[PDB]
Amino acid sequence: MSKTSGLYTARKLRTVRRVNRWADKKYRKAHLGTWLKANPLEGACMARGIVTQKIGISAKQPNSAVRKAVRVQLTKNSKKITAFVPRDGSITYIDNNDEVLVAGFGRAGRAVGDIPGCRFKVIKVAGIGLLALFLRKREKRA
Amino acid sequence: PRISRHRNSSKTYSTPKKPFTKPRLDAELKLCGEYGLKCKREIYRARYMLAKIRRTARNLLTLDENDIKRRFEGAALLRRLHMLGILDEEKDQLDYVLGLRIEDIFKRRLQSVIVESKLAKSVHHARNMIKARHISVGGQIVNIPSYMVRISNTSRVAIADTSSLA
Amino acid sequence: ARGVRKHLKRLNAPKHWLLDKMGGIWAPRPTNGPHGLRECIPLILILRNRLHYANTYAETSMILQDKNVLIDGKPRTDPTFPVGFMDVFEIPKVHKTFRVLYDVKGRFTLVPIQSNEAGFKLCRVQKIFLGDKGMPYLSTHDARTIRFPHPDIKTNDTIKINLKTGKIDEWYKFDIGKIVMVTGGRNCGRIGTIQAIDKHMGSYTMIRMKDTEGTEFLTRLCNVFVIGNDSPAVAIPTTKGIRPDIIKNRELRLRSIA
Amino acid sequence: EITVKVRKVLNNPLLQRQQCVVDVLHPGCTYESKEAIKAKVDQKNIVLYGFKTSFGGGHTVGFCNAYQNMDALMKYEPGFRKIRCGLIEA
RNA sequence: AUCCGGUCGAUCCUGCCGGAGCGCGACGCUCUCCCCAAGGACGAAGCCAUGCAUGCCUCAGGACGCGGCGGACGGCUCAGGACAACGGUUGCACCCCCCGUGGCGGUCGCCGGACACCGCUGGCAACCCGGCGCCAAGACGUGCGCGCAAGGGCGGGCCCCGGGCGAGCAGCGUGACGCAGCGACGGCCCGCCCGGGCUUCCGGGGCAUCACCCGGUCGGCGCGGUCGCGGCGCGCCGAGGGCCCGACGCCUGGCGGAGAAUCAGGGUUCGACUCCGGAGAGCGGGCCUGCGAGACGGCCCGCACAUCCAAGGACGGCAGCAGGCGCGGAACUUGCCCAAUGCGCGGCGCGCGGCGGCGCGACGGGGUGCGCGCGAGUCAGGCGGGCCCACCCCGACCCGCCAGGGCAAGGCUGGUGCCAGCAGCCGCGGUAAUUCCAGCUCGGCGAGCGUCGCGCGGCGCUGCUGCAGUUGAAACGCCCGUAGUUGGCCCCCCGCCGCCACGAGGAAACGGGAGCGCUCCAGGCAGGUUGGA
């Protein structure tokens, strides 16, 4: 019957499911424990760090552009990341020592769109929300 | 702990699963037009309050006509549905509960009752008059547009004796 | 812990006390005495919670300091004193005498009784044993002790005690066809006649009884109290140990607001 | 005001008092105080407390402790209610 | 009990990627009124200035002191610990227990002296103490008394089977020891009660790139120790004990349950925190006093850290309540009070707990009009409250956040010209852009909307119900074969399993659910003979 039947086979039916559960990439990513170790944010929604550089990144094949990003050192584990800055003209609030709050792009650690090697993005600069800085609701000191 | 930790609370509405469906999007605003509804939540609440009384009946109807659970809870459900006027006397069968719509629930609101007896010209004027403490239920001043009026208490809906319209 | 418990949270109090879950973090903890924690009621829960002679704890104390309450003929000055099944409850200044029994929902009720009845008590023989220098003793459901009992009295019988001398004047034997009342479980409070006794070697002995309308029920032998011989030796509530079904109870409830 | 009624009267010769629930009816107007309606419910042995007004007005419910002696009130009454009536003030 | 966009010139599939719902936190923007309500848990059980968290009543005006009861309960936390703990279910004929409530009470003439508070003198930086002296008891000490505390030797029947059992159990008699406890205001002792200690059966995480493991380990005999049984410890004797029905080892950002999130049915995931149980108090150990502690708002020692100082010494433990530092994406006042609910002593005590303050974590109700009267505010009096306030009553004045090509509801002008930028996915932009930046208009949800991460759903892409294996990923090259799983037909009316039904017994809160107009409502257990089934 391609599966075992019979009134006394509960142990086998449970062993098979336990073994074949690991064959799914989603389950293996969320349950094995290697992704939690390798995750730069250590399983958190966001993380703060200091900017070490400003950079421009080429887009992928069918598009043509220079995307604006920053290399960031993490406070809590001293890892190296790169984070994207959205919203036209926003790369002008980022001095080379500016505490930044950084979150993900969505897709839970996968690159999106046309930016090669980018999985994070800046949401706050030196204490102030970057979106409200673009919408002209608050301003930086000087 | 503090005593307040033992107090219960609950959500009383369910949002739909596909938000951007056109036919129920305009069917949902004809309802906001025939009744002075503030926002979509007051529709959601209604459907939620239907979805429970529909779950009970279908549980008892799967049972047998002579079981005590049917004899007890179906009688309780019918006795509760007849006092609020959500269901009428001539339908005293548990199978008459399943074909109920939301409009039956909306028709027993105080805002709707006062419109029926023509105390208010429209439903919007009725809502305004409700907020102004201008209407009493059984000699008791009721401020709530969403108030649910029992058939016992529908003979006795008036303007309040204390009022500027008296 | 490192020692005995002296507190009792409100949600952890026995469910037949009918305590309400707001209005307090704590509940009274019954003091040790004639009755256990689970099968009792703290005395305060009658004077304040039920009869409203007092309205707070502090003014419930002063009623019991000046000794206005007698339990089995003695003034108890302790608010968490455990009063329980068959205890005589007499308040003289209001001339109220009660006997503490169970109702048909397993809760304590007070039954008015006459001055010709409050001078005696029914106890259940819990055990016979040899004490010091080999003398015989019997122990009851009230933590009472009697030396040199008449040899006929055996375990599970009930005895009748005058409430001033503290001696025995009558006894009822546990048999077939005796009138009985259940003191705990889930048939607590209802009254019937014994029609079976099934012993199981090593294990519990079960009793089958039958009400006065003929309803039959079962329980353990540790829960059946004899109240007489085909006629109850005492007074019982108006319902007389007949338990309605939920439908008839509902129609009686509908009739009260009617 | 013009309408004062009482129910749930319990005589308590242990605390030397009588306990009551009082309903006050004042359609349209206020009832001005408890010190006012104290006449309808001697006067100095009446202890009035726990008064609530319903929504819209017109109804009030409260509680009465009516003592018989005067030592009884200084003995069995909480030490802050005797200051709300001006009887001690410390 | 629902799907939709993306592989091609076009087409049907497999298959994933993306979208659409609910919940929990964090971030952004924004906020009129009222009710309910969580709040330094998240590999830092990291470190702590200051104040508070435990007191209340026999002998003289009172304090003070002596004596007594309590401080082992209550509060905090989740570090350790995976055949533990914990949940249901048994037992002690192997046990200990304060208070309280019943009992019981037979034991080979009013005694003594001395300690603190206190006087007189001192030492010391301060912590803390010394010397001499008059004085009491419901404190000790010794005791007046009809002999009886522990332990011990004999008192059983050689198919099979009341004092009290299912069960030879408990008492008593009689020979020897012993001289305990209770007696200077009469209590040793006994039953119950609550509580504890262990204990029977079933349940009780992952990894096989951990296949063999253990040697007081498995059993027996004898003593010791314990409240008590027991390899619990010690001497002697034997070689046992566990394992693919997964032992042993390793790992866990592992406290368990009652429960919670999601939602056709079957399921998946999480169990910091309210109740119940366990464990700890910087980390190891040790102990005294007591009925009860291996106690940390008790003591002693080692270690790691701090504190004052005349340099001789003395001295500490916020995972209590506030508060601070550090850390982190992430979490409030150094408030008032014993009035309530309860606990200790009886009149007090109590950072238990209660009341206010901060509080868009989250819940519930009502507004920004209607065809012409209101609420939000203001000032007074009530009501309430430990005292003030909020609510209620009477009197006189008076949005926003995201979008607009498709998925997916909603389309004209200027700027920019593969640049700037958008875009979860398809894609958009090359100087006519339905998508960038703006203006107008329009759409959705709405005092609340968007973004990030995670759980559940979507998903019959984990499949027991219920997937796939000719060619899309997938039948071992073949035969034998143990454990495992499975096994034709037949006798009915016995026994022993399983299985179905009905009972008994044990916890509430949660979850359902009968009845009841907190003005409705989230609630609560109310109420007008009652009720909480």
Ligand SMILES: [K+]
């Ligand atoms: K198959």
Ligand SMILES: [K+]
């Ligand atoms: K299959």
Ligand SMILES: [K+]
């Ligand atoms: K198979």
Ligand SMILES: [K+]
């Ligand atoms: K089988």
Ligand SMILES: [K+]
């Ligand atoms: K499989």
Ligand SMILES: [K+]
């Ligand atoms: K504990």
Ligand SMILES: [K+]
């Ligand atoms: K103890």
Ligand SMILES: [K+]
């Ligand atoms: K204790």
Ligand SMILES: [K+]
């Ligand atoms: K409680």
Ligand SMILES: [K+]
């Ligand atoms: K409670």
Ligand SMILES: [K+]
């Ligand atoms: K509680």
Ligand SMILES: [K+]
């Ligand atoms: K107590």
Ligand SMILES: [K+]
């Ligand atoms: K489904």
Ligand SMILES: [K+]
């Ligand atoms: K396609």
Ligand SMILES: [K+]
């Ligand atoms: K093709």
Ligand SMILES: [K+]
């Ligand atoms: K396809």
